[PDB]
Symmetry: C2
Subunit: 339 residues, 2 copies
């Protein structure tokens, strides 16, 4: 019997994520937590005719939320908004994550912890260092959820191909494009590295290729702009987070994944092929990257570095630009907590 806990279940991402999870046939118990309104939402979702019992909990009941939880989804965090800077946004979400991840350490230390809160590049290290300090860190069980970059890469590959010549475009299926594209690096801007694995499609995009790459990298900013500062991508974040959790849940049930080269943002030095990945990205000491993972029983047991062993010269340049900015993001998270 698998129990999923959602911490931040009442926010803009949290609510549609809770709905998508209630629909999963791999979940048998769904516990919803937040500082307000989760009981109500959980009661609303308990009426859906799927086989999972769903309960929400009040601000004071994070212990009941997390008890016997195998998977913990953390979408909690303050959204992008006009009068908020990225640094204050970061510092507030840093406090939310540390507090929530500390609760996981006390109440469900063996849970697979899926961090959805942004910025992923800086907040995952806050979660790891928090678990290290308590003596509760298992590298295979802490994943920064970067799956929305893949989603967008799948969507835009088709959109740019539909633009360049509808012939190959109208042949694509957006639902199956992960066989053709993989995304690695971090989860913001130029840290994001879209790798089209199907090299015929690169050629066919021709000069649309750099437009594609830029569009995947800046997809977050596009939605903020389209909601005039007053929101970011909530429904698609919920969707990507549910898709990624479904892959983790499939693995509990000894099924194979659906996504080819499914990536998450993980702690390299604690996993198999991690040091190999550090070399391949050109920084023997970089602690995190989003790379293709192999899951056993919900947990990352190795990193598949295949993608890094066949980079184009242009991709190698995306990597080296990404690694430079990513290092600063990692260092920013880790010093905020360690100092």
């Amino acid at each position: 019997m698998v129990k999923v806990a959602i911490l931040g279940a009442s926010g803009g991402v949290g609510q549609p994520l809770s709905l998508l999870l209630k629909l999963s046939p791999y979940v048998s118990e769904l516990a919803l937590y937040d500082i307000r309104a989760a009981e109500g939402i959980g009661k609303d979702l308990s009426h859906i005719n799927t086989n999972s019992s769903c309960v929400g909990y009040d601000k004071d009941s994070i212990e009941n939320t997390l008890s016997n939880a195998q998977v913990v989804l953390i979408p909690a965090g303050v959204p992008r908004k006009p009068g908020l800077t990225r640094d204050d946004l970061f510092k507030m979400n840093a406090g939310i994550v540390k507090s929530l991840v500390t609760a996981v350490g006390k109440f469900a230390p063996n849970a697979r912890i899926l961090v959805i809160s942004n910025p992923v590049n800086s907040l995952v290290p806050i979660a790891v260092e928090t678990l290290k300090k308590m003596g509760k860190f298992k590298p295979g069980n802490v994943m920064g959820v970067t799956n929305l970059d893949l989603v967008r890469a799948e969507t835009f590959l088709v959109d740019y191909l539909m633009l360049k010549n509808p012939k190959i475009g109208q042949e694509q299926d957006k639902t199956t494009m992960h066989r053709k594209v993989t995304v690695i690096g971090g989860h913001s801007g130029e840290t994001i590295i879209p790798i089209i694995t199907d090299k015929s499609l690169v050629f066919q995009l021709d000069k649309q290729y750099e437009h594609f790459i830029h569009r995947v990298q800046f997809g977050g900013d596009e939605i903020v702009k389209a909601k005039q500062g007053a929101g970011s991508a909530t429904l698609s974040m919920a969707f990507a987070g549910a898709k990624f959790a479904e892959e983790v849940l499939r693995s509990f049930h000894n099924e194979k994944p659906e996504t080819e080269s499914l990536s998450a943002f993980v702690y390299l030095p604690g996993l198999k092929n991690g040091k190999k990945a550090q070399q391949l990205v050109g920084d023997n000491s970089i602690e995190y990257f989003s790379l293709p993972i192999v899951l056993r029983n919900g947990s990352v047991v190795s990193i598949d570095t295949s993608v890094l062993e066949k980079l184009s010269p242009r991709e190698e340049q995306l990597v080296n630009t990404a690694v430079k900015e990513l290092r600063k993001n990692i260092e920013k998270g880790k010093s905020f907590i360690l100092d």
Copy 2:
């Protein structure tokens, strides 16, 4: 293959309904409309890697939202604040539906209109009478979405069986309970008529049967109380809405519906076997009732009255009590248009 428009896509039901609708493989084009925020929500959802083209529209562009739409979902309506009066909450939504159904008469008269706003018992007649004044009413194409009653009956039948007879409870699958229960009638309180079609489960339910009946009837109010007046069942309303929509869209192709005895709140005098239904519910002038329907190409081509012909004595009593109070609802909606 088909364009779907959603009117009221930024509201509490509408945003989650729009996400679920983005996931449907039966949709070619998904158009979102609201007084505000639909552009942004549409742009968010356009990043999801499913094949539909998703565009949102501003308050002045309802015409481009509806152009060539074949199915139109109307979740629009006002969110109950903890103050709001029974009566005046109808009045506000009555005006919203009249306005939006008139836009449909003008800009997509052939479209299947799925009314999701509440109260459905009064809002569909409003919808129908509005379209009658314009001379655009096609009776196969106006449907009050009552599916959440079937969803809850499916859910609560399993929950009640589990609470008192775990052995048989645990052999139930909530996703497939529609083979074993049908809900008919109206869409509010004692107008809701749950008909357990599988007679063995009436026995298995034993002394819980009345509690089941009552839970289906008063499901909504359960959620309002759990939100302390500050909202309602938005997430399950969206689920049941996408689920009905998907049966509608399925109808355009060579596929049996998934749900057995799928019901919608429809205009009896305009549909094959409607007068029989009128006869069998024992009011030969009642104009509306939720009954199992047959969809061909998105439209009700006839009503299926079988469930009416095998009613138990208790279920006849529900039908009579539900008919009295449902006549009242229907008239309160006709009199907002006809006076």
